[PDB]
């Protein structure tokens, strides 16, 4: 299974620039590449990636997406003087030409294809291409919006042709619509295109009616084009995560792509003079992380726009940090998306409801200068994952995992804890696991050397109480508990420091807003239901809660449809800088193996196709959203009714 992250870059792509006055294009400068690579070098990220060389796209590769007549016209620009280049540039909208731009365009395109090949041949897990010129606005026969050839459209058509892929997701988080990509795949159900973009009711570039939410694709491609227009500026972390949890991710995991390509424009970040949005560079760590379980981690990130050199460098580093598997930064201050974003989100979900299972319940009444703080460092843990199997069980562990070694001070604390709170306890198994829990938690919370952990335990009540209480005094200001099992746990949810998610078999009405209890009907549809609950309820609440530790718990009677556990374990590491402790009750080799693999950052196997969720499950989940969304605004995917 593949490892490592490709970084594709060449300073030749910085060797073209604007040669005449033009306020429209003067923001697109060679230094965008210079600053981005140097930022990667400064933070040690470039040195940890596999450098893959650029190459030129061939004529045949360019003709996959562009016409012979347009290619022939651009092929003449190396021979043009400045007067001729200015006249050629005026034939198109918001683009300039240069004697070297055709050369660099072929390099930008070939760099993208090198990235696709490295990933699809399993030479790396994922990667990023830092290229100029950008691509997503160029069209079959036109340059547009600083773009000459459509790098990301190349990549999907090339991956289709040479690897016989049937399902490719393109995520365009640039602040501009990628109209070239939309047109290219408009009728194609094999390529799902998602774009959010500043729109402001069509008054923002490129000013197209077809960039609105109503453009869902055409013909057999209906439903495979998703536009989320931002109709106000100033969108925040909360708006972007609301878009992912309530539009993009439900569709992406149902689509089940075989490759993910990201049109990564960081002009959607705070400080950008084109986007004027307010999302922090740290959000891109999470946008990257939330997509990484798709396609077994095969993600090709391709630079598009991004014009504030400071914002650009930091967002590029946050993206590569996540590609490398470094712990995600904690996002504070999350809450409801703004009303304009909620309107865009509800409109997209409604028009897309004829095409996607996660939205289908919506179709029937019965159913329903700027400055910001510098980002903190993101150190990978010395040993990412510590494992404590039952005594004697020897397992083959991934390279960045390690077995537990109870210390002297730790042993004294178990004695103190036993005397005070479990007088009768003398079971020397239980007492060993308590020493393992405290030992693992101490390494997780008081060291950057261990990130997360898994401990197999015997008695849930004592181990849960010790794990929770010990974390709450480290101190962990807030703890998210995720419990797969029935019954009640020694978990008090009164003081706001604990949020409890419970996946259980018995229908039980929960009474307050710090618990989410999910009672999913048994059957062949448990998987789709849980995925729908995870993306649409669990993750929105968990992100807003912003825990300092995640405590996972699985009762023994519930280890037999839990094919979702690896996705949850991977996605929930977006919280608490990845600090997750999982307690598995009883030995199951496969569950322990899956848990350790996901905790350690390994690729997650795809879920493939799934029987769409039970309508009773969707009803249960929407009643949870209604009950919780006034407290946890990140759950909202409609505009609230005003009094
Ligand atoms: C690559 C892009 O999407 O950032 N293009 C920006 C075009 C700006 C036109 N004023
Ligand atoms: K976009
Ligand atoms: K499509
Ligand atoms: Na012009
Ligand atoms: Zn852009």
Swiss-Prot record:
Chain positions of motif Substrate specificity: 23-26
Q: Which reaction does it catalyse?
A: N(8)-acetylspermidine + H2O = spermidine + acetate; N-acetylputrescine + H2O = putrescine + acetate; N-acetylcadaverine + H2O = cadaverine + acetate
User: Which residues are annotated as site, described as Substrate specificity?
Assistant: 274
The keyword Nucleus is assigned to this record: yes
Q: Where is the active site?
A: 137
Keywords in UniProt for this one? Answer: Cytoplasm, Hydrolase, Metal-binding, Nucleus, Zinc
One Gene Ontology BP term is: homologous recombination
Q: Which GO terms describe its molecular function?
A: acetylputrescine deacetylase activity; acetylspermidine deacetylase activity; deacetylase activity; zinc ion binding
SUPFAM superfamilies, alphabetically?
Arginase/deacetylase
Catalytic activity, EC: 3.5.1.48, 3.5.1.62
Q: Which CDD domains match?
A: HDAC10
Residues binding Zn(2+), per UniProt: 174, 176, 267
Q: Which InterPro entries match?
A: HDAC_PDAC, His_deacetylse, His_deacetylse_dom, His_deacetylse_dom_sf, Ureohydrolase_dom_sf
Q: Where in the cell is it found?
A: Cytoplasm; Nucleus
Q: Mutating residue 93 to A leads to what result? A: No effect on steady-state kinetic parameters
Say which family it is in: Belongs to the histone deacetylase family. HD type 2 subfamily.
PANTHER family listed in its UniProt record: HISTONE DEACETYLASE HDAC1-RELATED, POLYAMINE DEACETYLASE HDAC10
Its biological function? Polyamine deacetylase (PDAC), which acts preferentially on N(8)-acetylspermidine, and also on acetylcadaverine and acetylputrescine. Exhibits attenuated catalytic activity toward N(1),N(8)-diacetylspermidine and very low activity, if any, toward N(1)-acetylspermidine. Has a very weak lysine deacetylase, if any.
Name the chain's protein: Polyamine deacetylase HDAC10
Source organism of the structure: Danio rerio
């Amino acid at each position: 299974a593949a490892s490592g992250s490709a970084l594709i870059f060449d300073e030749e792509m910085s060797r073209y620039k604007l040669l005449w006055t033009d306020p429209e294009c003067e923001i697109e400068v060679p230094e965008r590449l210079t600053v981005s690579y140097e930022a990667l070098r400064t933070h040690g990220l470039a040195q940890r990636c596999k450098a893959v060389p650029v190459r030129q796209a061939t004529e045949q590769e360019i003709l996959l997406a562009h016409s012979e007549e347009y290619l022939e016209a651009v092929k003449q620009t190396p021979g043009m003087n400045v007067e001729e280049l200015m006249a050629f540039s005026k034939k198109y909208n918001a683009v300039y030409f240069h004697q070297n731009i055709y050369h660099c365009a072929k390099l930008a395109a070939g760099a993208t294809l090198q990235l696709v090949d490295s990933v699809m041949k399993r030479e790396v897990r994922n990667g990023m291409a830092l290229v100029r010129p950008p691509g997503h606005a160029s069209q079959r026969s036109a340059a547009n919006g600083f773009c000459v050839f459509n790098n990301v459209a190349f990549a999907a058509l090339y991956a289709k042709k040479n690897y016989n892929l049937n399902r490719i997701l393109i995520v365009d988080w640039d602040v501009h619509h990628g109209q070239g990509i939309q047109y290219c795949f408009e009728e194609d159900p094999s390529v799902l295109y998602f774009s959010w973009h500043r729109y402001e009711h069509q008054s923002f570039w490129p000013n197209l009616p077809e960039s609105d939410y109503s453009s869902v694709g055409k013909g057999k491609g209906s439903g495979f084009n998703i536009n989320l227009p931002w109709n106000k500026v100033g969108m925040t972390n909360s708006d972007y995560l609301a878009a992912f949890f309530h539009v993009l991710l439900p569709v992406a995991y149902e689509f089940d792509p075989e490759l993910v390509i990201v049109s990564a424009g960081f002009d959607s970040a705070i400080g950008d003079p084109e986007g004027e949005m307010c999302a922090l560079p740290e959000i891109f760590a999470h946008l990257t992380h939330l997509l990484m379980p798709l396609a077994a981690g095969k993600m090709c990130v391709v630079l598009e726009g991004g014009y504030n050199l400071t914002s650009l460098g930091q967002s590029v580093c946050q993206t590569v940090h996540s590609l490398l598997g470094d712990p995600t930064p904690r996002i504070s201050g999350l809450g409801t998306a703004c009303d304009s974003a909620l309107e865009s989100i509800q409109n997209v979900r409604n028009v897309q409801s004829s095409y996607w299972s996660s939205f289908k319940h919506l179709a029937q009444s019965e159913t329903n200068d700027i400055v910001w703080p510098e980002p903190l460092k993101r150190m990978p843990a010395s040993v990412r994952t510590v494992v404590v199997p039952p005594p004697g069980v020897e397992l083959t562990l991934p390279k960045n995992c390690q077995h537990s070694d109870i210390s002297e001070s730790t042993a004294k604390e178990v004695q103190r804890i036993r005397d005070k709170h479990f007088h009768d306890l003398t079971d020397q198994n239980i007492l060993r696991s308590l020493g393992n829990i405290i030992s693992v938690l101490d390494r997780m919370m008081r060291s950057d050397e261990v990130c997360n952990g898994c401990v197999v335990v015997s008695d849930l009540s004592v181990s849960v109480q010790c794990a929770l209480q010990h974390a709450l005094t480290e101190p962990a200001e807030r703890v998210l508990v995720v419990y797969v099992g029935d019954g009640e746990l020694p978990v008090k949810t009164n003081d706001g420091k604990v949020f409890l998610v419970q996946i259980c078999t018995k229908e039980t009405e929960d009474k307050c807003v710090n618990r989410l209890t999910l009672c999913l009907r048994e059957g062949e549809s448990l998987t789709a239901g849980f995925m729908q609950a995870l993306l649409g309820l669990i993750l929105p609440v968990a992100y807003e809660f912003n825990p300092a530790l995640v405590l996972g718990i699985v009762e023994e009677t519930a280890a037999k449809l839990m094919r979702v556990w690896g996705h949850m374990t991977c996605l929930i590491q977006g919280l608490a800088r990845g600090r997750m402790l999982t307690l598995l009750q009883g030995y199951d080799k496969d569950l322990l193996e899956l848990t350790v693999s996901a905790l350690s950052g390994a690729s997650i196997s795809p879920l493939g196709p799934l029987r769409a969720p039970k309508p009773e499950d969707v009803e249960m989940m929407e009643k949870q959203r209604q009950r919780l969304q006034e407290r946890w605004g990140l759950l909202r995917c409609t505009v609230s009714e005003s009094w």
